[PDB]
Design an enzyme around this catalytic site. Sequence first.
Site, PDB file in Angstrom:
ATOM      1  N   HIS A   1      -9.336   2.303  -2.732  1.00 23.10           N
ATOM      2  CA  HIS A   1      -7.984   1.930  -2.310  1.00 23.10           C
ATOM      3  C   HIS A   1      -7.303   1.098  -3.389  1.00 23.10           C
ATOM      4  CE1 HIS A   1      -4.530   1.394  -0.002  1.00 23.10           C
ATOM      5  NE2 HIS A   1      -4.996   0.777   1.069  1.00 23.10           N
TER       6      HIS A   1
ATOM      7  N   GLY B   1       0.793  -3.523   4.595  1.00 20.14           N
ATOM      8  CA  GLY B   1       0.668  -4.897   5.044  1.00 20.14           C
ATOM      9  C   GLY B   1       2.015  -5.495   5.404  1.00 20.14           C
TER      10      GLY B   1
ATOM     11  N   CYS C   1      -0.530   3.027   5.860  1.00 22.94           N
ATOM     12  CA  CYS C   1      -0.145   1.778   6.498  1.00 22.94           C
ATOM     13  C   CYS C   1       0.129   0.727   5.430  1.00 22.94           C
ATOM     14  CB  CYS C   1      -1.228   1.294   7.468  1.00 22.94           C
ATOM     15  SG  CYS C   1      -2.796   0.843   6.711  1.00 22.94           S
TER      16      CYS C   1
ATOM     17  N   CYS D   1       0.785  -1.228   0.000  1.00 24.06           N
ATOM     18  CA  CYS D   1       0.000   0.000   0.000  1.00 24.06           C
ATOM     19  C   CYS D   1       0.846   1.322   0.000  1.00 24.06           C
ATOM     20  CB  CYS D   1      -0.935   0.075   1.188  1.00 24.06           C
ATOM     21  SG  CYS D   1      -2.148  -1.234   1.161  1.00 24.06           S
TER      22      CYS D   1
HETATM   23  C1  LIG Z   1     -14.612  -5.367   2.550  1.00 23.01           C
HETATM   24  C2  LIG Z   1     -14.689  -6.247   1.299  1.00 23.01           C
HETATM   25  C3  LIG Z   1     -14.482  -7.704   1.708  1.00 23.01           C
HETATM   26  C4  LIG Z   1     -16.100  -6.116   0.704  1.00 23.01           C
HETATM   27  O1  LIG Z   1     -16.192  -6.667  -0.616  1.00 23.01           O
HETATM   28  P1  LIG Z   1     -17.441  -7.699  -0.667  1.00 23.01           P
HETATM   29  O2  LIG Z   1     -17.144  -8.850   0.218  1.00 23.01           O
HETATM   30  O3  LIG Z   1     -17.595  -8.252  -2.183  1.00 23.01           O
HETATM   31  O4  LIG Z   1     -18.838  -7.070  -0.130  1.00 23.01           O
HETATM   32  P2  LIG Z   1     -19.444  -5.899  -1.065  1.00 23.01           P
HETATM   33  O5  LIG Z   1     -18.346  -4.967  -1.400  1.00 23.01           O
HETATM   34  O6  LIG Z   1     -20.052  -6.525  -2.433  1.00 23.01           O
HETATM   35  O7  LIG Z   1     -20.593  -5.064  -0.281  1.00 23.01           O
HETATM   36  C5  LIG Z   1     -21.494  -5.971   0.354  1.00 23.01           C
HETATM   37  C6  LIG Z   1     -22.882  -5.354   0.613  1.00 23.01           C
HETATM   38  O8  LIG Z   1     -22.778  -4.203   1.456  1.00 23.01           O
HETATM   39  C7  LIG Z   1     -23.372  -3.038   0.813  1.00 23.01           C
HETATM   40  N1  LIG Z   1     -22.574  -1.836   1.114  1.00 23.01           N
HETATM   41  C8  LIG Z   1     -21.223  -1.776   0.922  1.00 23.01           C
HETATM   42  N2  LIG Z   1     -20.768  -0.615   1.248  1.00 23.01           N
HETATM   43  C9  LIG Z   1     -21.795   0.144   1.663  1.00 23.01           C
HETATM   44  C10 LIG Z   1     -21.837   1.450   2.114  1.00 23.01           C
HETATM   45  N3  LIG Z   1     -20.653   2.143   2.169  1.00 23.01           N
HETATM   46  N4  LIG Z   1     -23.005   1.962   2.468  1.00 23.01           N
HETATM   47  C11 LIG Z   1     -24.112   1.230   2.390  1.00 23.01           C
HETATM   48  N5  LIG Z   1     -24.121  -0.024   1.963  1.00 23.01           N
HETATM   49  C12 LIG Z   1     -22.981  -0.607   1.590  1.00 23.01           C
HETATM   50  C13 LIG Z   1     -23.267  -3.386  -0.712  1.00 23.01           C
HETATM   51  O9  LIG Z   1     -24.194  -2.696  -1.561  1.00 23.01           O
HETATM   52  C14 LIG Z   1     -23.574  -4.908  -0.698  1.00 23.01           C
HETATM   53  O10 LIG Z   1     -24.994  -5.113  -0.681  1.00 23.01           O
HETATM   54  P3  LIG Z   1     -25.360  -6.640  -1.070  1.00 23.01           P
HETATM   55  O11 LIG Z   1     -25.178  -7.510   0.116  1.00 23.01           O
HETATM   56  O12 LIG Z   1     -26.917  -6.674  -1.531  1.00 23.01           O
HETATM   57  O13 LIG Z   1     -24.413  -7.178  -2.273  1.00 23.01           O
HETATM   58  C15 LIG Z   1     -13.600  -5.824   0.294  1.00 23.01           C
HETATM   59  O14 LIG Z   1     -13.896  -4.528  -0.225  1.00 23.01           O
HETATM   60  C16 LIG Z   1     -12.224  -5.798   0.927  1.00 23.01           C
HETATM   61  O15 LIG Z   1     -11.589  -6.823   1.026  1.00 23.01           O
HETATM   62  N6  LIG Z   1     -11.671  -4.651   1.370  1.00 23.01           N
HETATM   63  C17 LIG Z   1     -10.337  -4.676   1.978  1.00 23.01           C
HETATM   64  C18 LIG Z   1      -9.322  -3.923   1.119  1.00 23.01           C
HETATM   65  C19 LIG Z   1      -7.967  -3.934   1.776  1.00 23.01           C
HETATM   66  O16 LIG Z   1      -7.725  -4.723   2.664  1.00 23.01           O
HETATM   67  N7  LIG Z   1      -7.025  -3.062   1.369  1.00 23.01           N
HETATM   68  C20 LIG Z   1      -5.695  -3.043   1.981  1.00 23.01           C
HETATM   69  C21 LIG Z   1      -5.761  -2.336   3.338  1.00 23.01           C
HETATM   70  S1  LIG Z   1      -4.084  -1.912   3.885  1.00 23.01           S
END
Ligand SMILES: CC(C)(COP(=O)(O)OP(=O)(O)OC[C@H]1O[C@@H](n2cnc3c(N)ncnc32)[C@H](O)[C@@H]1OP(=O)(O)O)[C@@H](O)C(=O)NCCC(=O)NCCS
Lengths: 390, 390, 386, 390
Positions: free
Chosen positions: A346, A378, A376, A87
């Site tokens: 991100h 990983g 930050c 990152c």
């Molecule tokens: C968090 C994460 C697992 C979610 O992806 P996902 O598992 O496919 O879940 P989704 O993104 O499709 O969102 C799931 C649900 O929540 C809802 N939702 C998501 N964000 C929302 C928000 N901000 N407000 C309202 N509703 C929301 C979506 O519309 C979806 O509805 P559904 O259940 O009918 O499909 C993924 O984005 C992730 O791994 N993020 C981490 C990134 C990371 O680690 N970066 C490095 C950090 S150093």
Amino acid sequence: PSIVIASAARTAVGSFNGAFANTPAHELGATVISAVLERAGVAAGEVNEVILGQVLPAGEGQNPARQAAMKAGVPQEATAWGMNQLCGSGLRAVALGMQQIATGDASIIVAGGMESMSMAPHCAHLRGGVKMGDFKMIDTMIKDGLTDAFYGYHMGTTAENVAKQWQLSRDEQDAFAVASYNKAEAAQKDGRFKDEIVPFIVKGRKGDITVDADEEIRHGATLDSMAKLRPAFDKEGTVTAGNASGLNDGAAAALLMSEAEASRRGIQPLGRIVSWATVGVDPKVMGTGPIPASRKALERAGWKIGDLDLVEANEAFAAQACAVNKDLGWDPSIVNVNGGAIAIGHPIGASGARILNTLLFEMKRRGARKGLATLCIGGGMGVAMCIESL
Amino acid sequence: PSIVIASAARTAVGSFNGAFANTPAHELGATVISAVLERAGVAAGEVNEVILGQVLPAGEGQNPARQAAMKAGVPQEATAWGMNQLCGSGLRAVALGMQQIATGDASIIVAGGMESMSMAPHCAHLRGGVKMGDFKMIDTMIKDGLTDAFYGYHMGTTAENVAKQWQLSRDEQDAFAVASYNKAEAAQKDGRFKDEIVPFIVKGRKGDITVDADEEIRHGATLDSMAKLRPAFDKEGTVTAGNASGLNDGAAAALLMSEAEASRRGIQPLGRIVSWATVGVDPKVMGTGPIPASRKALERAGWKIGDLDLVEANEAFAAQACAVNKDLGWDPSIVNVNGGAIAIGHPIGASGARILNTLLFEMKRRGARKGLATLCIGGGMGVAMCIESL
Amino acid sequence: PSIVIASAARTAVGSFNGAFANTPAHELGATVISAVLERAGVAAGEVNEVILGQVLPAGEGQNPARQAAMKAGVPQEATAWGMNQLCGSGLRAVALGMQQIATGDASIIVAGGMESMSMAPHCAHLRGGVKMGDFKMIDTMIKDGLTDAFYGYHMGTTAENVAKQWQLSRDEQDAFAVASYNKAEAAQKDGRFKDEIVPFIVKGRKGDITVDADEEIRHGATLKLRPAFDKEGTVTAGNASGLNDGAAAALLMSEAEASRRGIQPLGRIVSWATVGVDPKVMGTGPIPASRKALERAGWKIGDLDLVEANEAFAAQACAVNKDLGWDPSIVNVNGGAIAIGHPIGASGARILNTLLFEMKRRGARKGLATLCIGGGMGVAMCIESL
Amino acid sequence: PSIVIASAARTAVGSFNGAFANTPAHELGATVISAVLERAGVAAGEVNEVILGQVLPAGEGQNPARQAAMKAGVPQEATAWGMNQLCGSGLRAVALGMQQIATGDASIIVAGGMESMSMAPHCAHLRGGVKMGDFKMIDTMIKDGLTDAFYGYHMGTTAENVAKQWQLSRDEQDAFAVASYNKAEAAQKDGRFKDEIVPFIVKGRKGDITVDADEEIRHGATLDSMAKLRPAFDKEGTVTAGNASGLNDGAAAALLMSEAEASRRGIQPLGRIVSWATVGVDPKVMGTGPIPASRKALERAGWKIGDLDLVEANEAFAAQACAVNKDLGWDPSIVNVNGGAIAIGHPIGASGARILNTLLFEMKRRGARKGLATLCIGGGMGVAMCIESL
Ligand SMILES: CC(C)(COP(=O)(O)OP(=O)(O)OC[C@H]1O[C@@H](n2cnc3c(N)ncnc32)[C@H](O)[C@@H]1OP(=O)(O)O)[C@@H](O)C(=O)NCCC(=O)NCCS
Ligand SMILES: CC(C)(COP(=O)(O)OP(=O)(O)OC[C@H]1O[C@@H](n2cnc3c(N)ncnc32)[C@H](O)[C@@H]1OP(=O)(O)O)[C@@H](O)C(=O)NCCC(=O)NCCS
Ligand SMILES: CC(C)(COP(=O)(O)OP(=O)(O)OC[C@H]1O[C@@H](n2cnc3c(N)ncnc32)[C@H](O)[C@@H]1OP(=O)(O)O)[C@@H](O)C(=O)NCCC(=O)NCCS
Ligand SMILES: CC(C)(COP(=O)(O)OP(=O)(O)OC[C@H]1O[C@@H](n2cnc3c(N)ncnc32)[C@H](O)[C@@H]1OP(=O)(O)O)[C@@H](O)C(=O)NCCC(=O)NCCS
Ligand SMILES: [Rb+]
Ligand SMILES: [Rb+]
Ligand SMILES: [Rb+]
Ligand SMILES: [Rb+]
């Protein structure tokens, strides 16, 4: 020698499998390289080297940083290379490009990062042969980008560790996330992202599409819909898809040169790199990386935390972002004034340069003198850079 | 400040799908990191950062450079990152680590490269879904390592371009390749590789195996078997599997610190980095990269070509290696006195630091004062570094 | 012994990646097995064996025919097996079940076919190991289902050979397809498919969905599509059958057995035949197969009141009609595979259901069903009403 | 009408990834089809239909039975098709071909089975697209061949259930396996497999190889070496790799015609099919399948168990074979006199015709009048056939 950022540019941050679903990373990088050259009045034939951070280059061919420079018009005489500090890659590449000019080995550097998480392939080692039984096709985005190599769980689980230690409730993380969406939506409506964003033309067969707005920014993000989401990592945890950054594509970069070089060209630099720092932490609590990294960067610059006028702290997770703000104690009203990665997105290899663009153009927009950008990393690391306006 | 190489170490170069067939690159890197620490009397807790070049990290998890440092015992407070400039990565990481100390942002650096081409996986982008028809599983080693992204052919084709422009016959390339095998076999028989090589223990279930000898070195390589081989790229060409470097695994690194720091610790450094350089060339003739890179490095050091006592020019192909020697005109008797990559092997991301080890340890045994290491880089680039003895 | 079809049933033909996009073949087969048992008033414990044709079973587990019978409620005492004669599997399984009772080795057989082309996986042989270079993930649906193993080109290219030999223009093949769409669209509006179709419940997480209508039937098919196989050919996506999922089967027993149970059979298998032809000109298979079946039945071509000739391609269907010379007004009166769909392993039993239920609806006495088979084969069956 | 087996032939049973590692199933089938035609003096143009059982045809193209017949020289006017009743396929195809002539729809049938478990591919459903995360590449041999579809465990687990019901100790199962190895090793030394085996020419690039001997036959299988093997399925069970049949490749078939047809041609048939039967059992104890199937087949033939002069009961597992022998109570000295599947191998789709070949040629060799062949079938089924010599 003092190194200044003569110009900077970034693409809109596209959603996972969204606008840039089939766009290779180097195509986004080439557009950003050409943008920072036009914005500074510098020709492609003057660039000595291109340094682009990138975490997921599998399948894109030999050295995608070289591909982005060549497509942007950088001549073959120049060099290009990529680097991976997860990152923090997008921001560390700027520090590395700064060192190329500091040691006298280069004059003009285009440094930044690019990432296409949508284009990440599934892979499996198949040379030895699968004699018998099933085997796994591994998602390179999860394996090489978002999974800790020492404890085996996702980066959201490390945010659960931070959430447990600093005692950050689910409501506090949701309030932070909602605030990030509202600040980003207001900034986008006010056009505060227009300067940093260079439009990208998604060349299509059916018709071209121009992407010039971050498509992750939601309009009307409510607290009730944020509290209805289930936890995404620990089934009895607090981190959800709403209070965590998503998967995104994009690119960002900056043009680097000495202050005397910019003065010879009549260029007004966006800022002066005064210091930078990178420190490691426990991989369990990787989100705390910005805490020792920012203090080390401020110490190298001779600044106190109160001296900062503007701060860009990447919001990997609401739990890690609240902990960094609470530990360092800087005024939250000057941190991520236009929103953060929870709402904007991100793109791993480019987020370091992405928040640098947001930091640089807001310092110019409101006349801030001292700024700081930090992320930050990983595996238990953090990176920070201090910028001063000229 | 003057930066010296306090110590260096490398693993044996393993054959493709051979001794290290199932060994991840970071496991090879960890052994080398621990070696350069023992050989210099420096504890792991003193390392500030680990910079390891690597071209094919797909499937190995988050930041394999961090994995190598953690397994070697480097504490979590330190940082680590990887970078990719293809075949010059192993040597460019040394130049980058030198800059970390030159700019005062670090005190002790472990820099080098690691590569496991055997562990490279096959990949395919499958997020959008293959609705109908066959699709390709792409070999990341060929795609991301050995195929030019601008013209689409293998690196052996670029050697055909050099052979045609320099008018290098098949017999001259075979004579060069045979000479590379004979020099390497004599050096290995005389034990001239013993100092630089640190043994690697291949942890197996049915007993451990210690690898301490380059397994690509052929004993009794005849010219008749070299002239009977068919061309490997152009069916009516001159580059064959015999007169070209192979696919290999291995790791190599060096410990960097300031000359005053090494003097304070009573260390006798292997050499002092006096200059370095990287230049780009036409991707069609990428094998000519060492020509402008070496001239720029010598110019930055204030040296003439005749001032060099020892030269290590990576032998990617017999055609490109002959052209570099003819163009630069240095005495061939001082270039690769113990053989080259044609006989020893070519682990892309680690070859830059590999030939640096061979250069450093041969300079010490025969008392050479000035040395130079250089490699060609895919996409049309070259890197070179000048070393001076203390 | 005389073998009668006591009952028959079929599922709606689903589009590729459509309603049955994630439905395994044996789940569709299990519904059909239970349907033909209920429609005849026969308990599952009376079935001796289940014979189900299926072309693409890769990844569905051990013997999907056994899975379909067990899930439908057929007890473990019975046996089950699958067979593959490509597009003739669904009809050949009925003839094979007829032979089980004719030879005295069984009393009650559930025979038919099932196919899920949407669930077909991509595969690659990886035991020896790919040391270096790219390799192909092979589409099993194309490779094992739609590609000739002797000449290497798609089945649409074989239709070009038939179209070229019989001199069938692009307009003549398209006119046949439009007529097939009009008859199929009209029949579904009149509800003539309701009896033969048994509804299938697609068990879903966000709610169940009942599929009871062939979703491939196009509304308003007008007489512009590019050729799908030959860059300068005549076979297009319009005048060719598509990729589909579905299942169909029939209940088999002796005529004396059906009379003892008070069952009114849909028809009696009087004869059957299968003949091979040149793989270059596949689609002409029904020509020697129907003549051989009619000869075994002692029937003339004019004796047929109703005919079901599978429309793999518009070019092959016109050639079969021109060569055999039967009245086209009695051939596929409710449309054909060009409009309804072509589930490979189940198409043989699909047109058998359409043939049986239309003979009953209009009181036809003698019927015939026939299909063409990839690799140069044909299958035909003669049915007589009671 | 009376149906006789005019001739029969089989290939050598090759080991998993052994001699036939890269041989498609239909190529093995074609050799057997041509063999039964030569051995009976019947031209290919007289064959009406070819019925070949095959369990794992994925990736071999349209109708591999049609491919085997065409390559063997059977004209295009004939027809061909495959069928799948798992391990009983090879024998059921013979019964199905017998019915084709009994019902008057054919005169000459080539029926048997073919299987290439080495050529079985790994597969995965990828049409809908893998949006995120890992997925499994499924071994079609394990999934579609060796895994129960109702309980999910391997066929060796079903043998553990049978072993527990009949109270079969580890020593009793190992003693049965040792006897099977000794009988097979003695038969191969005495040349008792020479008549049934037709040599197969493995067409290779560096030279052709003739395979004419079952390569699974072990020399000197002792009870001491059998008792050192670990259990292969249950961690505290009794079934091991030694007392269980392996994974193999091979093909076998027989030529079918009416008894009057063979008399017109002066053909002396190997035997006459007098009856056949198939019955289902609980899939948990699928190994008991041969018990009701053999009793039903003998009842259809009007024979008592004591009337049998020779018996071929397929040895899927040592535990399942002992239970069938105890239940039926026939003399063990007449069961698998030349060994069984534990030593010879178990090519799923071809095992039914494989043991039929062994029975026919041994009945001829010792003048046996009444014989029986039987196998167990996954999913809880069994198949049996009674043969009488003329
Ligand atoms: C968090 C994460 C697992 C979610 O992806 P996902 O598992 O496919 O879940 P989704 O993104 O499709 O969102 C799931 C649900 O929540 C809802 N939702 C998501 N964000 C929302 C928000 N901000 N407000 C309202 N509703 C929301 C979506 O519309 C979806 O509805 P559904 O259940 O009918 O499909 C993924 O984005 C992730 O791994 N993020 C981490 C990134 C990371 O680690 N970066 C490095 C950090 S150093
Ligand atoms: C050249 C290349 C294509 C060889 O592919 P390869 O076929 O797997 O090479 P192999 O050694 O495995 O097989 C080559 C044949 O020549 C023979 N051979 C190879 N080297 C020989 C030698 N030095 N002397 C005599 N015979 C030799 C081998 O034994 C083999 O014959 P075989 O079939 O009896 O085993 C591959 O090594 C390559 O791509 N190299 C490129 C490296 C590179 O690009 N580096 C970066 C450049 S910047
Ligand atoms: C149709 C087929 C030929 C592939 O064509 P495809 O382009 O890859 O997939 P589709 O044609 O179904 O996609 C539907 C398209 O056809 C068009 N189309 C097809 N028929 C049409 C019609 N009758 N009227 C109007 N439009 C039509 C649709 O508008 C759509 O347009 P699009 O290409 O922009 O998406 C495929 O069904 C096939 O391979 N069939 C082989 C049949 C076979 O082998 N049967 C075995 C027995 S031998
Ligand atoms: C049982 C089974 C899992 C074998 O396990 P396996 O480990 O893959 O078999 P392997 O040969 O590769 O390993 C067996 C080991 O025991 C040894 N061994 C095997 N048989 C032996 C014997 N009869 N005597 C002495 N030693 C023996 C082998 O040499 C080997 O030693 P290794 O450690 O060097 O590999 C597999 O053969 C199987 O699934 N069989 C069942 C097939 C089936 O279900 N058929 C359907 C019937 S309904
Ligand atoms: Rb979010
Ligand atoms: Rb070589
Ligand atoms: Rb269609
Ligand atoms: Rb065995």
